[PDB]
Amino acid sequence: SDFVVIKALEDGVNVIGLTRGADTRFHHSEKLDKGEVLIAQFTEHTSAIKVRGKAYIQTRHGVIESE
Amino acid sequence: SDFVVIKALEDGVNVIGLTRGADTRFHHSEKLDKGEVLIAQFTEHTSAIKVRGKAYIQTRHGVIESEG
Amino acid sequence: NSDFVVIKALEDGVNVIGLTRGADTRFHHSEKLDKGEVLIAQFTEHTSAIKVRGKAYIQTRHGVIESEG
Amino acid sequence: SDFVVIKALEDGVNVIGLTRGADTRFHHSEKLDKGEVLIAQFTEHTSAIKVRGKAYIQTRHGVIESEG
Amino acid sequence: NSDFVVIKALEDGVNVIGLTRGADTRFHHSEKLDKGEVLIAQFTEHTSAIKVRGKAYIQTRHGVIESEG
Amino acid sequence: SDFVVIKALEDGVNVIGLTRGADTRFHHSEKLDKGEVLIAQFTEHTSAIKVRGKAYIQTRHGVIESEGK
Amino acid sequence: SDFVVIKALEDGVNVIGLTRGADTRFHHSEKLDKGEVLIAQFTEHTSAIKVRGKAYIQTRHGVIESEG
Amino acid sequence: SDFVVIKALEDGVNVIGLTRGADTRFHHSEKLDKGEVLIAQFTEHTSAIKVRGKAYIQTRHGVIESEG
Amino acid sequence: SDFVVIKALEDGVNVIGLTRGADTRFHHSEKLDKGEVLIAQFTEHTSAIKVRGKAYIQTRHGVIESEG
Amino acid sequence: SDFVVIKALEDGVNVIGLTRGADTRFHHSEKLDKGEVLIAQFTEHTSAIKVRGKAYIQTRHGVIESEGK
Amino acid sequence: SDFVVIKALEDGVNVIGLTRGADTRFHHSEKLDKGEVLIAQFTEHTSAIKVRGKAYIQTRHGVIESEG
Ligand SMILES: N[C@@H](Cc1c[nH]c2ccccc12)C(=O)O
Ligand SMILES: N[C@@H](Cc1c[nH]c2ccccc12)C(=O)O
Ligand SMILES: N[C@@H](Cc1c[nH]c2ccccc12)C(=O)O
Ligand SMILES: N[C@@H](Cc1c[nH]c2ccccc12)C(=O)O
Ligand SMILES: N[C@@H](Cc1c[nH]c2ccccc12)C(=O)O
């Protein structure tokens, strides 16, 4: 199953997981401080991922940056 | 399953999931504020995704941009 | 796990039309896009062909093609 | 499962689906007007596709053009 | 999910002949193409070999080849 | 499943299927005259293919030529 | 299943496994000292990994560096 | 499933199929005259193939040439 | 499964397997003397591998070096 | 399943298949003379292959050459 | 399933299988003299392979050389 790499470029970045299934809501928000990296898969419980805050992101489709 | 990356280039962008199945309707709209990124899969419940508003989108077939 | 098509409307009133899978072929849904909206649409248990009408920039795994209104 | 892209270069381009199975005949003809695009899969019901008329065609093996 | 061949007729009366899969081998269908028409034909449960007669431009996963009439 | 493309470069080329299994024998010989093309799979019944006669051959390993008699 | 390579560039780097499932929490934190390498899979129990401290990281998507 | 192409560069090239299983011996020998081509798979009954005589051979790992 | 290559660049390099499962602990420590090479899979019992000591390592993701 | 290509570069080359399982021993030694090519798979019964004698070898990882005593 | 190629560069090189399973111990040591080549899979019984002595090694990750 595929994954996303997120590197926080500032304190307070949120990596938020969205529920798989008929309904869509946030079930977890992981806080990243500056320089921390999270590598996060899609899973049985998480079919969409939202990033809030400034971070460097890598996926299979290349690099993108949130602000 | 494939996924799409959507980065909102202005406030109020909507990423809209359309129902899988014989019926087609919107089941969810995720609102993105400028500079937020959403990485969203195709799923048992979502077989088409629509984006409204200004955004930079990546998929397996490359970059495309939506404009508001 | 199926393939998908990206459609970006280059004018108002673009229609992305889904054709039914199976022995019966007909249109079952027509999605209206206005200028600059994007639809990323899979082939599905219900949709085995997709017709685009109106001016649009389309990406498939075979590359770019453009429809003209 | 594979698909063919068909872009009509004139009115009345006919995309013809041939039946899968021991018998071969057409079971559907989808006409396209100039500039419309049809992205059609091979399926449980369609194992060969014929294009009549002027059309620009993409498949996994590259581009080909039909002449009407 | 089988492979498919692309056949473009370069003259009228090209024949794309499907041969039967299985222990026995015979022609089960000849699809006749006129000049400029394109047939995209899979290998299937019933067709394990395809013969082209007449002048045609052909694409398969191993490249381009041309039949001559 | 893999296939081979055979284009006859003279009359009377044979494309010969050998039986799959513990027994090996020819079960079919498809005659090609000049300019005809056969695109033939490996199958539940054919696990080896012999070409006799002058032909241009494509497989997934590239181009090979058989030389006639 | 995919894996991530982490080389500690300073002492006390923490590679933290997050639980797979409805619940998300840290179930393990592996401490690496300077110059140690950990190569770590996604698994039945671990569906996200977090690195804290200065490290050089390789994944399928290329190289990235965490900072302390 | 993999296959080899064998082109005979002289008369009487011998393509030898070795039996798959705990035992090894040849179960079939197909002779090729000069210029003939055999395209042969690995199968339930053949798990090694030997070529005797001058032949031009292609496999997934490139070209090799047997000499008589 | 994926495997890692580890070449000891000094004596007493440790290639340590961490248990797969809810619990994470060392189950095995393989000591390599200078110049020895260990080629080691991920497996039913081992879902993370830690290298301590100076070594040259190859993974699908490319080269990395652990240092003493 | 993977296979290795072995071309003998002198008489008397041996390609030795080692048994798959907890037990490791030689179950078969195929003797090759100069110029002959063996294309051998890994199998239910053979999980390692040893080559003794001068030979030119191809595998998915590239060319390697065995040298005889 | 993958394999590794080992060419011995001097006499008495040892290619050592380590047991798959909860337990890790040797199980078999194949001695290669100079110039001999062994091509060995990962298997139900072997999940790690050690090379001791001077040898040229190829894996899917490239060339590496052990030193005695
Ligand atoms: N609960 C939704 C979440 C989702 C995934 N991808 C989306 C795309 C758009 C909107 C919502 C979603 C689902 O599993 O289908
Ligand atoms: N409910 C439709 C939604 C859909 C997916 N792709 C489409 C293409 C065109 C029109 C509708 C669609 C389906 O699951 O098949
Ligand atoms: N209902 C038809 C639709 C179709 C798909 N590809 C086509 C090509 C030509 C004509 C019809 C089709 C099918 O599922 O087979
Ligand atoms: N009914 C035929 C259609 C077909 C597919 N490919 C062909 C090639 C030649 C002739 C007919 C065909 C089949 O399913 O096999
Ligand atoms: N009925 C034969 C047709 C065939 C396929 N490939 C061939 C190659 C040679 C001769 C015959 C064939 C089969 O299914 O096997």
Ligand SMILES: N[C@@H](Cc1c[nH]c2ccccc12)C(=O)O
């Ligand atoms: N009956 C043999 C035919 C064959 C395939 N590949 C071969 C290679 C050599 C000799 C015979 C063969 C089989 O199916 O195994």
Ligand SMILES: N[C@@H](Cc1c[nH]c2ccccc12)C(=O)O
């Ligand atoms: N017992 C843990 C080991 C592990 C794998 N990857 C990790 C990443 C971080 C922390 C622990 C791990 C598991 O199988 O999941």
Ligand SMILES: N[C@@H](Cc1c[nH]c2ccccc12)C(=O)O
């Ligand atoms: N327990 C969560 C952990 C997780 C994986 N990826 C995520 C992305 C965002 C938030 C949480 C996660 C899950 O398996 O789904």
Ligand SMILES: N[C@@H](Cc1c[nH]c2ccccc12)C(=O)O
């Ligand atoms: N009967 C043997 C034939 C064989 C395949 N590859 C080999 C390599 C070496 C020696 C014999 C073999 C087997 O199926 O395993």
Ligand SMILES: N[C@@H](Cc1c[nH]c2ccccc12)C(=O)O
């Ligand atoms: N019987 C052993 C053969 C073997 C394969 N790979 C090896 C590597 C080293 C030593 C022995 C082996 C096994 O199947 O596992």
Ligand SMILES: N[C@@H](Cc1c[nH]c2ccccc12)C(=O)O
């Ligand atoms: N018996 C161990 C062998 C092993 C494979 N990879 C390793 C890495 C480190 C330590 C031991 C191992 C296992 O099957 O898991």
